[PDB]
Amino acid sequence: NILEALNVRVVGTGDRILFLAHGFGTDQSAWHLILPYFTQNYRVVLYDLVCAGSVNPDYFDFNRYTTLDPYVDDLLNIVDSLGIQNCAYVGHSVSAMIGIIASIRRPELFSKLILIGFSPRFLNDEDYHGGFEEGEIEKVFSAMEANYEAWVHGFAPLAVGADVPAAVREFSRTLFNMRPDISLFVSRTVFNSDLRGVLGLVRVPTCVIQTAKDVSVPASVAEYLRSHLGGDTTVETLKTEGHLPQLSAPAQLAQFLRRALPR
């Protein structure tokens, strides 16, 4: 039922469950280039966040989805529904944030957390560089509301990077598939999140993957995470820019994953 609403799909064969969880602006199809590198050795679970354009917009209850907690409830519901007892989890952007909270709620559930394009807090603070200020983000939210199509038009290449047209085309496609109001509302939710208070409570081994230049995550965030996460943590840096390496640099990302994943 949640399995149907969130387009859960399980493919591959192997002992380890690999759980792939997409971020803002895409759906599980953003994993399609790396997926063949794993389906021979991992039982792979994919799903769409409720805010994905591929999910019936009728399921997006703006009354319910006001913080990340209902999203974590969705993930744990899927995990439980599938009867998954242990898995490796790869979360991009918001799914990274969701993964951290899930790990603290259910520490026995994750063998490993791989976090791509992950920030615990986007807004700056005293001695903390998240990369954004409140005045600044209000204008983005206005632009997103005023003219979503124009925002996407400009944002997709900036976010994804240069000379990767296939990646930009795909990211534009999935952004345009999201309902504009859902896009804005999810953005607001993410920008009002602050995980820095609970990072020390993470116990699961974690790999933080960053790219060279991510418009949403300053380079300094990775070393903050290394110093603040409570598990055994490593940082890997892709020699490639952009926010969506699963589309823009699938070979390098898959290589990093193959190094970091259990088995």
Numbering used by the authors: 5 to 267
Q: What's the publication's text?
A:
KAI2 receptors, classified as plant α/β hydrolase enzymes, are capable of perceiving smoke-derived butenolide signals and endogenous yet unidentified KAI2-ligands (KLs). The KAI2-mediated signaling pathway shows homology to another phytohormone signaling pathway, strigolactone (SL), where key proteins involved in KAR signaling (KAI2, D3/MAX2, and SMAX1/2) share sequence and structural similarities with proteins in the SL signaling pathway. The SL signaling pathway comprises a homologous receptor to KAI2, D14 (DWARF14), the D3/MAX2 E3 ligase, and a homologous substrate SMAX1-LIKE 6, 7, and 8 (SMXL) in Arabidopsis or D53 (DWARF53) in rice. When focusing on the binding pocket, several residues including the Ser-His-Asp catalytic triad are conserved in all proteins, highlighting its importance in the catalytic mode of action performed by α/β hydrolases.
The OsKAI2 and AtKAI2 structures were also compared to the analogous receptors for SL signaling in both rice OsD14 (49), and in the model plant Arabidopsis, AtD14. To that end, we determined a new AtD14 crystal structure at a higher resolution (2 Å) than the previously reported structures and was hence applied here for comparative analysis. Structural superposition with OsKAI2 showed an RMSD of 1.2 Å over 265 Cα and 1.2 Å over 264 Cα for OsD14 and AtD14 respectively, and both D14s gave a sequence identity of 56%, confirming high structural similarity in all four proteins examined here. However, there are some clear differences in both the positioning and type of residue found in the pocket when comparing the KAI2s and D14s. Most noticeably, F27/F26 in OsKAI2 and AtKAI2 are shifted by 1.2 Å in respect to the positioning of F28 in both D14s. Similarly, F195 in both KAI2s is shifted into the pocket by 2.7 Å when compared to F195 in both D14s. Furthermore, both KAI2s possess Y125/124 in place of F126 in D14s, with the hydroxyl group reaching 1.3 Å further into the pocket; similarly, both KAI2s possess the larger hydrophobic I194 in place of V194 seen in the D14s. Conversely, we found that A220 in both rice and Arabidopsis KAI2s is replaced with S220 in D14s which is slightly larger and more polar, perhaps indicating a role in strigolactone binding. Collectively, the differences between KAI2 and D14s demonstrate that distinct residues reach further into the pocket in the KAI2s, suggesting an adapted and more compact pocket to better fit KL/SL-like ligands. Generally, SL receptor D14 responds to (+)-GR24 due to its similarity to natural SLs, whilst KAI2 proteins tend to respond to (−)-GR24 more readily.
